[PDB]
Amino acid sequence: LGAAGSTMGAASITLTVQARQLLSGIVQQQSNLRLTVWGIKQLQARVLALERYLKDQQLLGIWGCSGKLICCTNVLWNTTWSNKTYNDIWDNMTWLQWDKEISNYTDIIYGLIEESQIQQEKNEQDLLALD
Amino acid sequence: LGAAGSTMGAASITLTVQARQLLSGIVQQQSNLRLTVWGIKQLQARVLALERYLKDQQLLGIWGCSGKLICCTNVLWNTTWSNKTYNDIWDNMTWLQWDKEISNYTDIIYGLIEESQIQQEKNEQDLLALD
Amino acid sequence: LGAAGSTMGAASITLTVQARQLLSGIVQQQSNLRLTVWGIKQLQARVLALERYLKDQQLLGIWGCSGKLICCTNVLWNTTWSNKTYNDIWDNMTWLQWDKEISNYTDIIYGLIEESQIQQEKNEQDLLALD
Amino acid sequence: LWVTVYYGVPVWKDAVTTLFCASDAKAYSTEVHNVWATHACVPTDPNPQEMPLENVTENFNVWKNDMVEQMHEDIINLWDQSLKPCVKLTPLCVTLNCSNFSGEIKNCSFNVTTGLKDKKQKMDALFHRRDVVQINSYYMLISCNTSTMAQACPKITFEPIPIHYCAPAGFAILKCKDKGFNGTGSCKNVSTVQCTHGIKPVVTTQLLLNGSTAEEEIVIRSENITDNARTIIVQLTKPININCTRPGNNTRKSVRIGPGQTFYATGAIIGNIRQAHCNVSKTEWNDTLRQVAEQLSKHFPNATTITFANASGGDLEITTHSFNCGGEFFYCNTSKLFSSTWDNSNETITLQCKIKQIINMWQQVGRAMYAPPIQGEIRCESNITGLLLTRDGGANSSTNETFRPGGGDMRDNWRSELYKYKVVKIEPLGVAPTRCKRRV
Amino acid sequence: LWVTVYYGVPVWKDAVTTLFCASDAKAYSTEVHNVWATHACVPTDPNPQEMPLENVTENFNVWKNDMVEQMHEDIINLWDQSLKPCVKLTPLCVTLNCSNFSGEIKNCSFNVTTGLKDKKQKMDALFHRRDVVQINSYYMLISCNTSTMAQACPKITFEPIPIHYCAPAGFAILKCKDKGFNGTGSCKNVSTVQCTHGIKPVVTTQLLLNGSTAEEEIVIRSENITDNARTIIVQLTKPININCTRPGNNTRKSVRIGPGQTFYATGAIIGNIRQAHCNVSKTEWNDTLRQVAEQLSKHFPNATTITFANASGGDLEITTHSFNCGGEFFYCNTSKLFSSTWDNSNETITLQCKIKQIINMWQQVGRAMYAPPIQGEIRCESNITGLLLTRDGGANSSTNETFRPGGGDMRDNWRSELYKYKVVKIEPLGVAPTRCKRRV
């Protein structure tokens, strides 16, 4: 999380860092080697840390971005999702204040992402190779 | 599950739909924010929903189909696994009655799938690049 | 685990075998269909079997080897990590006695693996396509 | 203009999850099973990785941090897990024909049950005046008509142990390293950690013992200063050395109201009949109190007056200093500390302390715990770090200002260690437009 | 020279995880709820896949295998889960005006409580001499001044059931198939399994019943032979046929010390007044003992002497053979078995056995269990497979050698079934240099 205050272009240089401390909680406690409050608290926390990871990898999967941390898509960026340029976004703003500016339309984009491409592109792709 | 009653060709156009409601149970209950019956029931159910997902992705992995939802293989379709054509299967039958017709030989096919290719193709592939 | 005593070249021909009995514990017990000692013991064991799997796939992901069981990298093998040849390693030694010989430097290699390539190669790769 | 996915963006939101324990594993093969560490607490990390965060402007909130409630819930739960299996003091509410001991303490005589049921036990014991009340005169334990009394096992200790509350992956603990940090609001220096530092569950009222130490100036934190109903909590920068001693050389006697139900009481003590007390260096106390008056004048007019008075009314925990000391519960007359007057411009003081064996803390009607006696003279020492003050309220404004000690809630003690902590959940899904596009 | 990753390499390390149960599901719709199987144990695999491992040289350690401790913990836990909800025998420690029965067994008279509280119950019962002690003379149950007595439910059985302890994925159970296998050290023939075989939790002292059978020669296993403090455990290769019978046709009487608290005692028995006993074929015993003397001479000089004597001192479990038999606990006089002398070169024997209803096994001060009576004459048979011997220690070396039966710990019984097992964790991350390299 070192680049949490850097520009989006600068921050985009350490995505492995955010990737590490999101899935592995088993180095810190693979077991701790029983109805105590601590046992239930620990177990529910360990499940949640991988439960959240599997939701995001699930979204990347159904969007055809399973293998990659950075994937480009075909959906257009509608300018109503704020008018800016490449440099005004990637070299002067941080991902925090960016996520706040685009948090309004994240749902609409997700709906287009799953339908417009990976479901039209793939369905036409299945009908093309399945011929 | 909208295309559950459509033809296999028609149904094959919405595999993301079956993919979504199989892995993410954490939108419905990432936590619910303690020995009650409901706590144990919830936790065991949440684990099972990702436990089943990891079994199927595991099979696709050891079959060399990890990244894709649709993969083609090298194993021949033995005609004893029922005699039909492409159109009699994909444009007139649903996946339900199809899975019932082929449920008899799913095990044999899985054994050939893991051995015949992804273990002969990959082992010869390791001996070819490792030279 | 059939090739556990074979040479590394011979053993490298059955990685699916070690891959199978590492992730799926849900065929043996998807549920067992409640505060007994056996319920907690079972649940913690089932979580741990997929918890360990997700740690290793996590490391392969942040090293850019997500989709593959065998991946080649760019980091040099420093000869201080023992001096041997291809044949003295792959056709006369087993993975067990090999892992014992290299267990000393596994940490250093992991640090170089995540930084030297997948973080320099990918960051320069992001700056090249993001241009 | 094309949407692009970036998994693992440094973006988070405000939420709360199921935290858990983390304490260094001490074998303690001779004496184990303290309530907080239990049979197993998760071990800590050998190297506490503390990563600073630059250009991070975030508002902390201690008075609304739900971690304080979750800790307060886990404490009461951990206590209840240690009171159920031990002896249920129901074969003890008998008529106590007490005689004045050779006045607090009473020498009583009563009839109990032996290992047999029909065979009764004619025995004696010794308790404090706040343990029984009359109905010579006949006495009965105070909690016999309210809450179920149950003796705690003599093996489980009550000594506080540091707890490092953590958070799983996907969640993070933000630490504000601001020295001059008002309790809430923005913090210029925010850092992130996976676990907190050593926090002792110091079950105490008014005087906070063995707590955290502020930096530079004595920090003053209150949810609302102009509201007298809100309890003001302070955090000192210089730890004092307070000493409480029970100079009574008590003895433990073991009766058998079984089967299996063993009861340890107080027998004929040795040494001297010396009541409980504590010591406070008058010089350092007066020196520390003057710094308090110099810090209280920052929320009041420049030329004013600060008046200190003892406790008004309420229970003996609200009026006297409640705390633990080697197993016994001490309650001290803090009237000699709070009786001064301060304008704009080498001996020690002692406080009369009382000991109670039947505790009813948190005011849970229905359940009760008995403190087993402790052998030998007890001597405890601590560092007082915080205080729970309270205004008087309705009066002519800016005339005089009076401050009295309070203790309306026990959660205020957990606020003294969680003022610079905050749990946030990581949102790694990032969407940003780039000139890049996918294939066909 | 380039580093390469190989996920899934046959590499493992020594560790331990949370094992669990595995037992075949028997409906038992008429009588269910034995303590070990509980309401649910995980089912087994229909085909036990046992994969052998070639060229695998690994050292096993039974005396340091933590699986024995984890089993011993789960056993005591499973027992406690079956003793809490049943009747707490506290309305039973009354004065017992006992008369000598028409001497062990006593015909007692006492006053209890009925369904009402003020209405008391004038009733009788029958127990053994080791159940009550005096204070005619008046008696009291022995454990009424020590541990809380609590009757077990008459529905939960105590018959052992085979348990197949497993290990989750990422962990494996290694089985050493060496016939002539010393307890610890390297093993030429190592195999891997996911679960163990049928292991009965045979709660017994000295004589091991219904245990595993060694191969070829009778295996001798001891942590240290020259240390008399270490208990030596043996594993036979030929199972014997031992028969224990309680020829007393007892009857069960149901009193009501309720509400809900029902108590089943022993009434006027039928048949004959015949004490408990066991049978041992003197020919096979003498034949088996001779093979023991021929195996003991492998850890001693060639021309020596082996002396057998009865138990020295200790509790009645250390001196007599403790074991279960249809619900009742039997304790036999094993003095007639251990009284022989052996140099270098068709009837049956009987042993006087006693029955105890109030058990205090594992020496847990505070808790106790009562064995409910069993109707009809009891007859049990088993195969003795192991023995817990003990030297006398300090004496002139290599003169004579004396061996006495011991039973200092119950974990020694679990060692008899876990001597060829070992848990290891799989490390699938492999790094090896190849001439291969990635792209740019």
Ligand SMILES: *[C@@H]1O[C@H](CO)[C@@H](O[C@@H]2O[C@H](CO)[C@@H](O[C@@H]3O[C@H](CO[C@H]4O[C@H](CO[C@H]5O[C@H](CO)[C@@H](O)[C@H](O)[C@@H]5O)[C@@H](O)[C@H](O)[C@@H]4O)[C@@H](O)[C@H](O[C@H]4O[C@H](CO)[C@@H](O)[C@H](O)[C@@H]4O)[C@@H]3O)[C@H](O)[C@H]2NC(C)=O)[C@H](O)[C@H]1NC(C)=O
């Ligand atoms: C704020 O913080 C301060 C400081 O942290 C707290 O002060 C603590 O108070 C508690 C009581 O509330 C004390 O606990 C007691 O400690 C005694 C001393 O413990 C040590 O010594 C014991 C005896 O050993 C002595 O002899 C040997 C050999 O001659 C010497 O080397 C050694 O130094 C001693 O002089 C040891 O047995 C023990 O393990 C420690 O090493 C104990 O006497 C006492 O009980 C003992 O006996 C019990 C009966 O068997 C047993 O159950 C205990 O485990 C223990 O053995 C008790 O533990 C702390 O010692 C004291 N200091 C610290 C650093 O914790 C203060 O209480 C706190 N404020 C509040 C409100 O909590």
Ligand SMILES: *[C@@H]1O[C@H](CO)[C@@H](O[C@@H]2O[C@H](CO)[C@@H](O[C@@H]3O[C@H](CO[C@H]4O[C@H](CO[C@H]5O[C@H](CO)[C@@H](O)[C@H](O)[C@@H]5O)[C@@H](O)[C@H](O)[C@@H]4O)[C@@H](O)[C@H](O[C@H]4O[C@H](CO)[C@@H](O)[C@H](O)[C@@H]4O)[C@@H]3O)[C@H](O)[C@H]2NC(C)=O)[C@H](O)[C@H]1NC(C)=O
């Ligand atoms: C070492 O191993 C040996 C062998 O494994 C152990 O020997 C076992 O000892 C235990 C006692 O400790 C015995 O348990 C008892 O079994 C009795 C027999 O069980 C069967 O028969 C019952 C009656 O059926 C009879 O009649 C029918 C019809 O005529 C016949 O077909 C049948 O063969 C019988 O002749 C059945 O009810 C029962 O289900 C079995 O089929 C039982 O009589 C006894 O209790 C019965 O009644 C109870 C009261 O309702 C009930 O709760 C029980 O469930 C049961 O029904 C009790 O169970 C074992 O039988 C005996 N053998 C085996 C193979 O286990 C030895 O104990 C062990 N050593 C140690 C130290 O444990």
Ligand SMILES: *[C@@H]1O[C@H](CO)[C@@H](O)[C@H](O)[C@H]1NC(C)=O
């Ligand atoms: C914080 O901002 C300053 C200037 O605004 C910049 O120099 C510095 O690199 C920033 N820190 C981070 C971590 O981005």
Ligand SMILES: *[C@@H]1O[C@H](CO)[C@@H](O)[C@H](O)[C@H]1NC(C)=O
């Ligand atoms: C960067 O952001 C600030 C604040 O929005 C703005 O004032 C400034 O003009 C921006 N500069 C560039 C080069 O985009």
Ligand SMILES: *[C@@H]1O[C@H](CO)[C@@H](O)[C@H](O)[C@H]1NC(C)=O
């Ligand atoms: C978010 O969008 C909604 C409608 O899409 C609009 O009403 C709302 O004002 C927007 N919020 C902001 C902060 O722009």
Ligand SMILES: *[C@@H]1O[C@H](CO)[C@@H](O)[C@H](O)[C@H]1NC(C)=O
């Ligand atoms: C159901 O069948 C009818 C005709 O057989 C068809 O028109 C319709 O599309 C089918 N529905 C689905 C969901 O496939």
Ligand SMILES: *[C@@H]1O[C@H](CO)[C@@H](O)[C@H](O)[C@H]1NC(C)=O
């Ligand atoms: C489709 O299925 C039905 C039922 O099996 C069959 O009668 C029909 O002939 C099929 N039609 C085609 C075109 O395959």
Ligand SMILES: *[C@@H]1O[C@H](CO)[C@@H](O)[C@H](O)[C@H]1NC(C)=O
């Ligand atoms: C399934 O296959 C088995 C043998 O492979 C055969 O005996 C059985 O009849 C088949 N079932 C059906 C419904 O065809």
Ligand SMILES: *[C@@H]1O[C@H](CO)[C@@H](O)[C@H](O)[C@H]1NC(C)=O
């Ligand atoms: C064991 O070693 C022998 C010779 O050393 C070899 O022939 C055999 O294949 C090896 N077994 C395995 C499983 O590698």
Ligand SMILES: *[C@@H]1O[C@H](CO)[C@@H](O)[C@H](O)[C@H]1NC(C)=O
């Ligand atoms: C294989 O290993 C053995 C033991 O290290 C060694 O003696 C032998 O020379 C090696 N042979 C080859 C061909 O590498």
Ligand SMILES: *[C@@H]1O[C@H](CO)[C@@H](O)[C@H](O)[C@H]1NC(C)=O
């Ligand atoms: C492992 O490496 C360390 C330093 O890197 C060295 O001190 C140690 O001796 C090495 N161990 C072996 C077995 O070579």
Ligand SMILES: *[C@@H]1O[C@H](CO)[C@@H](O)[C@H](O)[C@H]1NC(C)=O
């Ligand atoms: C209580 O004690 C007093 C003083 O010994 C005695 O006179 C009186 O009889 C006692 N009463 C009872 C009920 O024991």
Ligand SMILES: *[C@@H]1O[C@H](CO)[C@@H](O)[C@H](O)[C@H]1NC(C)=O
């Ligand atoms: C206890 O009981 C006896 C007789 O039952 C009586 O003499 C004695 O005074 C009682 N003790 C008390 C303290 O009441």
Ligand SMILES: *[C@@H]1O[C@H](CO)[C@@H](O)[C@H](O)[C@H]1NC(C)=O
């Ligand atoms: C119990 O008795 C005391 C003194 O007799 C009294 O103060 C208290 O109120 C009583 N408890 C209740 C619940 O009334």
Ligand SMILES: *[C@@H]1O[C@H](CO)[C@@H](O)[C@H](O)[C@H]1NC(C)=O
């Ligand atoms: C934050 O830290 C810097 C140096 O580490 C210091 O100069 C600054 O005063 C700190 N901020 C506050 C509010 O104390």
Ligand SMILES: *[C@@H]1O[C@H](CO)[C@@H](O)[C@H](O)[C@H]1NC(C)=O
């Ligand atoms: C502390 O002071 C800051 C600024 O002076 C203010 O924003 C904040 O609300 C204050 N906190 C409290 C609890 O009064």
